[PDB]
């Protein structure tokens, strides 16, 4: 299973 | 009396947490002096997280590509560099809330407090330990990258961990504040897995001493053991071996309680064989291994910061 | 992923902790606006705490009898008065770090963060619940009196607890910030016992929902139950009765996990009769009752402050 | 056993 980089998404 | 999983007061770290946004990717940053430290994978988009070339991605980046917000004030980035897996963004303003601080790298078994943050805002504080497999068992969601682990013994804040990513078993991996990962993990979304986790034996023994200091004695016995025999038993329960250094480390607690280390080891062997049989030790039915001998003396003798 | 006992960030509370000293008796005070709050037994000497007459003890004291230190700065006391078991010291300087706050008295079973302090300096923070018998199973030593418990609601600090004393069993008792004691206790050094402590049932269920969210599913079963059937079993195991308001409050976790509250109650009933089958839930071998339903929603959704 | 008012002693 892939690791998950725990950054977030932000609308531009 | 009483024993609790105590974290350090998080105020000195709260004043350093900012939001770093690059393109559509956002995470947390650590604002100390005129530098903001954050995980370097903030510069990846959606399809540059499997095999990113960070040196190449950073070269394509300009100062105005980094949106840094300390609350409602946008910080002006005037420079950027990369040290291992951490990104360093130079701003034009020194953080006035910068505490007296330090960067340290810790070994497995060490404890520290984690200030979980999202979008630069604190969400909660909890205590945790560097497991022998170089992971931590934190509570992290997407956007929590950049949250830091720390200790504040005496007057100085010792930053020891910055969060990066979550592994398939739900445990977490990160770097020190110089960007060097704990363990053999990399900041790529490729297949990674933590090794078999073991119990921090020296921490369990320190916690048994804390139980004795707090008046619990039902688990003691009249037996002693050799270090080799205790180790031969300990590995059978996936416990870390106890070294002579660990025996010395538990010296002061042994002197305070009048119970020799190898004596306490014999009662640990019995607890592993028997279980607790309806009893609890300091409010737990499992053997706690996230309290160092330093933590025990700190909470039971003299607490101050 | 992951679930930890998370305390609130303590930065706003840290900036309010001061030291109060009356004679050789010293403890912690809460400096809000131009008033310092602290336990009234700060005017007691050691011989006074057996059967103190606080009305008489305070009448012999003036403003000059109170040494209030906020760091290396002494605050001039310009007035003093007693409100229930809390002393109110008016000082000539409003605290510049006064946050948005209010005084809230909490219900048993509710949780809050404790900022334990010694000599006016914060030393540790930990999350805990107000037990149904109105005690706190805290970690407190001499000099920790005046430490405060708090919640953060939206952007407001909700002070709910101030520490006073330790009971002979090792549990702790205190008041709200208005001086009203939690539980049938009095601030004097006499024999005092707390009522029988029970398990906060709604918190166990909320904690069981947190485990399902994190993948722990073995305790689920096909069966359901009724409130009357569960409460008949729960009361026999010293569990607080479950009410219809408890069920409604668990609604968000019932819909998110797809497990009805009465279905979870069926699992909880089974765990009370057959034990935990030799397994663990969220890394614990006990049924954890220090997570309210809102605590689970908060941690699993990443609510910040 | 009696309860303990958990103030501290401070030599003045």
Residue numbers in the entry:
A (entry chain C): 193 to 204
B (entry chain A), C (entry chain B): 1 to 305
D (entry chain D): 205 to 216
Give me lines lifted from the publication on this model:
The SARS-CoV-2 translates its genome into polyproteins that must be cleaved to release individual proteins essential for replication of the virus. Given that Mpro processes the majority of these sites, any intervention that stops this process, such as an inhibitor, would block viral growth. The crystal structures of inactive SARS-CoV-2 Mpro, with the catalytic Cys145 mutated to Ala, with 9 substrate and 6 product complexes were determined to sub-2.5 Å resolution. As in previous apo and inhibitor-bound crystal structures, Mpro crystallized as a homodimer.
We used 12-mer peptides, P6-P6’ (with the scissile bond between P1 and P1'), in our co-crystal structures. Six of the nine complexes were solved with the dimer in the asymmetric unit (in P21 or P212121), with both active sites in the homodimer occupied with the substrate, while the other three had a monomer in the asymmetric unit (in C21). In these cocrystal structures, both active sites were fully occupied with the noncleaved substrate in essentially the same conformation. We observed that the substrate peptide was extended along the Mpro active site with the scissile bond (P1 glutamine to P1’ residue) positioned between the catalytic dyad in all cocrystal structures. The N-terminal (or non-prime) side of the substrate had an antiparallel beta-strand conformation which was conserved in all structures, with the substrate residues and side chains well resolved. The binding mode of the C-terminal residues (prime side) was more varied, especially beyond P3’ position, and lacked full electron density. In addition to the fully conserved P1 glutamine, which is stabilized through multiple molecular interactions, the large hydrophobic residue at P2 was extended deep into the S2 binding pocket in all structures. The sidechain of the conserved P1 glutamine was also extensively coordinated in another hydrogen bonding network. The volume from P4 to P2’ is highly conserved between all of the substrate complexes, despite the variation in amino acid sequences; this high conservation reflects the specificity and likely evolutionarily-constrained regions of the enzyme.
